Ligand binder design. Structure first.
Ligand SMILES: O=C(O)c1cc(C(=O)O)c2c(n1)C(=O)C(=O)c1cc(C(=O)O)[nH]c1-2
Ligand SMILES: O=C(O)c1cc(C(=O)O)c2c(n1)C(=O)C(=O)c1cc(C(=O)O)[nH]c1-2
Ligand SMILES: [Cl-]
Ligand SMILES: [Cl-]
Lengths: 254, 254
């Protein structure tokens, strides 16, 4: 715990130290990196991570709605454009659908969101609800797990082709695009964090907010582990079919 | 799937059939019932389920905030009284703390909420968030897993004394109190559902809301299983200490 307020430069390094808990250290990721994941595990990861990807623009729009500073909104909106496309070009959500196709899943497999597990849904929804309710500065700075993302994207680019040569080349476009996007994103996030977190109280709170974000990522992979590695998906004692709910209940009627 | 609107009696039958997916069928519950859970597994369950218990009055207050009908509010507030108590350590939250003491945990172990796993937190927070955002009728009716609760309370009253004689008597007061309270609650909840859900569209929607509620309960137990049965609590690959966030971030500073 911080007792005497860190300088902006020392505070940046305390945020970066949270990378010790990044999801690159989760066994599910480690198995994929080492070549020990199954195709079913890879497909399940791609289908479930699509729910996070399609939530990113929702959460960034939520931050914008709570942010009365036009300067900050002019920069932040680029995140929405990167994922949704500008306009019919493509964008990150389309690139994720192409990763789906590269691992053998149809566009409808991903777009239906029928394979998204409830533990993934509750973790990703927690991110959106924080973004809706927290002050904009706190919600914007919870993006800063992006500090650690280029390293994980590059790890996949380096390892997957050797172990999983059946994954089509087009599939890798998203990970390569993020090497530059995540870097520009954090150039903004860090400036915000270092300006805003100017007391020991705000610095400790922000570190706890970043821990919450890391917990979301870890918990998504825990749900995937139960379902696809341990043959304990929801209701496995009662049925062999998927029985969980499949609807963003507060955003869509059915 | 319902095509032609069910009668109120047939709709009740449809709600009751969802009991097939109730958490009495989860392996973590089954192990406790059969006498095969460890003292640590039982203590972890009591500490984590306290986060659900302390959220119930928050959720019920959220329902009331969204309910412009005074008649309904006059009935619903009794749920808040039941958990918070009319006076003194009276109430269900205090009874759960006494269950904590009966299994060997202090009041601070529970009140600090330091043992609450992120997967339990995100599932339970999903409940609260639905109650804050959905229409009051739908949020109220998501209580209807109470249809199945007296049986699970009775299962513990029947099995635990013999398997776990070290659990102190006073521990069993909460489960016994809920045999009557859950029945009083569902009298109202089922009357509301049968009156409100008077079209095929509303009936289909409500069965999906009840499934969402079932999925929350199942996912809480999946998180406990990872941490306490499978030796895979968060961050186990990089630390032996608890490193998850421990704060209701949007409701308390820290
Ligand atoms: O593949 C990954 O492991 C990973 C992790 C994260 C993260 O650290 O939050 C993001 C992404 N990918 C990603 O593709 C993405 O567009 C993204 C946006 C954000 C954010 O919080 O706004 N995180 C991440
Ligand atoms: O011990 C159990 O398995 C169990 C289950 C549930 C449930 O079915 O939602 C409740 C409770 N307990 C409980 O003690 C309680 O006070 C309660 C209120 C509610 C509700 O949704 O408002 N559910 C439950
Ligand atoms: Cl990224
Ligand atoms: Cl109950």
């Amino acid at each position: 715990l911080i007792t005497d307020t860190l300088s902006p430069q020392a505070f940046e390094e305390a945020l970066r130290a949270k990378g010790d808990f990044y999801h690159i250290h989760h066994p599910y990721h480690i198995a994929m990196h080492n070549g020990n994941a199954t195709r079913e595990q890879i497909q399940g990861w791609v289908a479930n991570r699509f729910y996070y990807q399609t939530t990113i623009p929702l959460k960034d729009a939520a931050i914008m709605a709570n942010c009365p500073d036009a300067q900050t909104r002019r920069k932040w909106v680029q995140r929405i454009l990167d994922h949704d496309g500008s306009h019919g070009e493509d964008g990150g959500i389309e690139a994720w659908l192409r990763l789906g196709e590269a691992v053998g899943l149809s566009r409808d497999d991903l777009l239906s969101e029928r394979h998204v597990l409830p533990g993934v849904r509750f973790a990703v929804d927690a991110y959106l609800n924080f973004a809706r309710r927290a002050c904009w500065q706190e919600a914007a700075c919870s993006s800063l797990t992006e500090l650690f993302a280029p390293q994980i994207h590059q790890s996949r680019l380096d390892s997957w082709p050797q172990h999983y040569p059946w994954i089509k080349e087009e599939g890798y476009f998203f990970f390569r695009s993020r090497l530059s996007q995540a870097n520009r994103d954090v150039e903004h996030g860090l400036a915000l964090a270092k300006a805003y977190c100017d007391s020991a109280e705000k610095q400790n709170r922000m570190l706890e907010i970043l821990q919450f974000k890391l917990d979301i990522l870890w918990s998504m992979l825990d749900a995937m582990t139960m379902a696809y590695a341990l043959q304990r998906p929801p209701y496995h004692t009662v049925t062999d079919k998927a029985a969980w709910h499949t609807t963003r209940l507060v955003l869509e009627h059915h």
